[PDB]
């Protein structure tokens, strides 16, 4: 059944190198869903952060339609190994490092719906660059993004669009694996740009990270007040015993330095 349906699709002349045809010659429209699993290692020094997500791409390839209207056949057939299919050569423009998960069987899923609609799902670990602004460092908010776009195909061949409903989703155990920050807001936007090689379509998801204050309250502010307050208890020592005053004023000043360091 499934194995036969797949066989039928590729027994004919099918070229995974050839872009899927369109009715008006328009570009292949790729709908994108994105599921963040974990956001970790938010490096302020190198201004980057890591994040593992599930990319989900969906386009139409009439050449792959087997059931068409179907209603007598399976809704979709799972694409098995050894069958090539044209896929959007998407990459992450602001990715500095990236890995696919391949433990046991590779972590991918490809479905070929009867009408020719393809679903593509893949786990990807990324290390993205996120320029940060520390003007209010102790109490700041940063905005980190993931950019997704085609590398070779221009605006005439491939166009990205965020899924209509819930384009960006978060796994339930994300905020719990992110102890130092609070993921307050997320946004789903377009970053299509015009370059020297052409105009390339591009999506951009953005998360907003609010830095947790409890740490800085306890490790910075509290202990500094407690340090300044100590320098005051020397105002109550007799003006004759200066050794005591200097010892206080100097030790609290030195400690202040260390703390800041």
């Amino acid at each position, epitope marked *: 059944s499934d194995s036969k349906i797949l066989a039928h699709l590729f027994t004919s002349g099918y070229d995974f190198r050839v872009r899927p045809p369109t*009715d*008006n*010659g*328009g*570009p292949v*429209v790729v709908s994108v869903n994105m599921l963040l699993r974990t956001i970790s290692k938010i490096d302020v020094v190198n201004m980057e952060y890591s994040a593992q997500l599930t990319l989900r791409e969906s386009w139409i390839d009439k050449r792959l339609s087997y059931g068409v209207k179907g209603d007598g056949q399976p809704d979709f057939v799972i694409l098995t190994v050894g069958h090539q299919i044209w896929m959007p050569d998407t990459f992450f423009p602001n990715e500095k490092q990236a890995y696919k998960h391949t433990i046991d069987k590779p972590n991918v899923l490809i479905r070929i719906h009867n009408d020719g609609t393809v679903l593509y799902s893949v786990r990807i670990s990324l290390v993205l660059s996120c320029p940060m602004y520390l003007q209010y460092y102790p109490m700041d908010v940063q905005q980190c993004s993931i950019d997704l776009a085609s590398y070779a195909y*221009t*605006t*005439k061949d491939i*166009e990205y*669009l965020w899924k209509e409903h819930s384009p960006l989703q978060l796994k339930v155990g994300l905020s719990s694996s992110l102890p130092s920050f609070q993921l307050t807001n997320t946004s789903t936007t*377009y*970053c*299509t*740009s*015009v*370059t*020297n090689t*052409g*105009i390339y379509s591009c999506l951009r998801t953005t998360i907003q990270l609010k830095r947790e204050f409890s740490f800085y309250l306890l490790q910075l502010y509290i202990p500094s007040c407690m340090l300044v307050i100590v320098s005051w208890v020397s105002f109550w020592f007799d003006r004759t015993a200066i050794p005591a005053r200097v010892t206080l004023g100097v030790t609290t000043l030195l400690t202040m330095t260390a703390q800041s360091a």
Partner: antibody
Amino acid sequence: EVQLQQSGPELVRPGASMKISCKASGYSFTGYTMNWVKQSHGKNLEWIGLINPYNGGTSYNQKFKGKATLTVDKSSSTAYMELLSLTSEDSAVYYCARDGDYYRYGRYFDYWGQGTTLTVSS
Amino acid sequence: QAVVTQESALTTSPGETVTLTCRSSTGAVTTINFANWVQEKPDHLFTGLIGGINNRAPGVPARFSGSLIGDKAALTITGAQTEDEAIYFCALWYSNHWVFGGGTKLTVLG
């Protein structure tokens, strides 16, 4: 307030070529890409092409491929358009229209210029 | 090739709600057409209204709004004003270039 001021009207003989300007002010010039639109009596509005000031990059309407040459002078915040092998059909009003997005292509128009009237007659 | 079609002219009174439409010849206007709307006041004054995905130009009044009613791009002015009387061009994006419509001459009765 942003402003796009284009060069004055021009009269040129067929076969010649002239270049109209579009001086931008009131915004970071290199952040928004510029469109060029041609409004002729004979037809509707036509989209000639666009140029990204920051990038130098250009993209022309297949129709005007070789007829127009978009350039940009960062120092003076000016966008220029060359028109080669001018003929009767090139007699029109040429507008320049800024793109909406900041350091990215948004595919939507902000501000236009007052237009430049080009007359090619013999 | 592809051609864009608009109402030759429309009429409306101050306060009413008028709707201009933009039609594609190749088929239904989809999101990848990035339907744009441009206004032309007398003396060659062009300005953008709507465009791209669902964004608008700086300062475009709240009464202006875009949508994909039926199978063509729409521009709805809820609460028309006197100054709203102008020529409205819609532009569709076909693969790699823009194609403008004939323009609709909206008249606000006086």
